[PDB]
Amino acid sequence: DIQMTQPPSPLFASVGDRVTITCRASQSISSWLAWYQQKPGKAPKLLIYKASSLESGVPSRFSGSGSETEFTLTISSLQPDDFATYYCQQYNSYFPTFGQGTKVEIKRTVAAPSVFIFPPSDEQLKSGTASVVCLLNNFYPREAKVQWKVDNALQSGNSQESVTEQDSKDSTYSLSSTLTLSKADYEKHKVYACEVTHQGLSSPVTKSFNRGEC
Amino acid sequence: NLCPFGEVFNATRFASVYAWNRKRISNCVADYSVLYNSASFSTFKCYGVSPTKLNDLCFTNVYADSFVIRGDEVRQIAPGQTGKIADYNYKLPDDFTGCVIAWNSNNLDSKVGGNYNYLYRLFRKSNLKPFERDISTEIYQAGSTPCNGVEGFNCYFPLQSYGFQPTNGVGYQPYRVVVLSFELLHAPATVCGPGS
C-alpha cells in the first residue's frame, strides 16, 4: 500500500490566520492527491483534486500544492466554518488510502489545568474493583501527560483517558483518566497519585491520597 | 520482404489507449525473434504460441495494436482482466492467441507540466467487447438529467488525461504497448516466419 502521513492534531488557528496542512506519501504518487474536509457528525466533502484544482463550490481561500511525496493544503484566511478535520488521499492507484487527518481547533491563551484525584468509592470496592480517577479541568493546549504512580511506581497499561471536545465558551479541554485495579491489589498499596505535566504548569503538579486515610 | 514491425514498434508517435492504433499485417515474412531477442521490453508475454517457435509458423493475418498506458496498467493488457483499461479502453478476449509487448517510454512521452495528449476513457456504461475501439466523446450522463452535450455536474467529458509528467513513480510513467494478434482462417497464410 501507500501510507499517507499528516501532522498530529490539533492545529490551533484564529479566524484570519493562514493555515497550511502537509501530507507525506510513502512513495511518489505524482500529483494524484485529494483533500477532504469533515465536521464532526457529518460526512467528508471534497475540496481539492489533482493536488491543486479547487473542487467546484469550494471557496477560493482553499488552495493545494505539491507533487511526488509532499503536498500542502492552504487556507489563505481561515473563516469560522473552516474549523474541521482535513484528510489527504492519494487516488488513481489500484487501492486508495487516506492520511490520518489533521483537526484545526480554535486558538486561545495557554491555560493550566486544575487537577483532582478521586479514590474508589466504598460502593465500588464492595463489588470487587477499584477505579481511581484523575481529572484535568479546563486546560489549553490539548497536550498533557498524566502519569499514575502507586507507592511511587510509575503505572503503565492499566489506565484509560478521555478528553472533552474543545469548549465553546473558553476553548479549553478537560481530561479524565481512570486507573483500574482489582480490589485485592488496590489494598496491597498505600500511596496513589497522578502527576500532571502541561505547558501551563511550571513543574508537574501531583495530586495524591493514602488509601483508607481520611 | 519483411513485415513492417519497425513501423509499429519504432513509430515516434503512439495513440491514446482509448483510440488504439491497429496495423493489419499480411503478405510478408516476419522474423519475430528480431523483437524476441532485442531485450528492450520490460514485458513480452505470449498466449497460445511459443515465442521462439513463432518463426516456424504462418498465419492468415497478423494484427499489431499499439497505444500508451501507465506502467502499472500493463497488467490489464491480458486475457481475463478487469479495470479502467481492460473494461473501457482496450479489451483482449479470453481465447487470445498473440503476444503482449511493452516498454518504458518516459523519455519520449513524459512532458514537463503534464503531457495532456495521452488520454484514457474514464466513464462508460458498459464493458468493451474484445477488440472494440470506442472513440466517442459524447458527454457522459451520470445523473437523471440529460446532459445535451453540455458538461457540468453529473455531466462528464468521458475522457481523462494521463498528464504524464516527470515522476519518480515508475508505475505512473507511460509505457508503449504493442499487442500482436495471430489470425488463422481458411484462406492463404500470407504472414510466415523464416522457417516454412
Next chain:
Amino acid sequence: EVQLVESGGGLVQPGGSLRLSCAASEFIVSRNYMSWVRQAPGKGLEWVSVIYSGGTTYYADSVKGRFTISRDSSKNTLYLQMNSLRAEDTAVYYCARDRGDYLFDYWGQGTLVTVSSASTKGPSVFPLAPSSGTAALGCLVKDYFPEPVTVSWNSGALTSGVHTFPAVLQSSGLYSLSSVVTVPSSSLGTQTYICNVNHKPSNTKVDKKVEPKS
C-alpha cells in the same frame, strides 16, 4: 435534489451478517462508480469496495471473501452484504459516489455498524466524592453497553461547570464514562448534588447523590 441515504446499520455479534443499503436520487447507481468507505470511531477513513458501472468490483483486502458489493438498478440502490463480521468492522459505513479513479466527491451521511459480543447491560453509578474555593465532584458511570448513556445534574438545574467525558471501551467490551462538575467548596455541605444517569437500551435510570466522605 442529489442524495445518498444509507440504512441497514445496527448492532450485530461477531460471525453475524448485515446487509447495508444506499438509496440514491438523481444519481443513477448503475452508471457511476459507487463505493463504500468506512470510519472506525475516532479513527480515519478506509475505502471498502467499488462497483464499476460496467460491472467490475474491487475490495479492500481486509474484507475480501466476507463482503460483497452489489446494486439494484430497478431500485437505484447500492448494497453491501457483510458476512462473518468481526469486531474490527465496527465503523460508520459511508456510501460515496466515486467520480472516477477513487475520487469520492459526494458522501451519504453514513450508517453505523457495531460488531460486538457484549451483552446489553445497564451501568453501575459510583460517586466521585469531593475532597477537603473550588471543589470537584463527579459520577463514574461504569460497565454498560451499548452506547449511549446520558447524564444530568440535579435534574438539569446544574449545568455550569459540567464535563461529561466521552465513553471509553474497556477490555471487557463494556463502556465506562465519567461526569464531573466543579462547584464552590463552600456549598459542599449545604447544596445537594445528584447525577441522573439514563441508559435507554436497558431501561436503567439511576440517581446518585454525591457527598463528601466522613
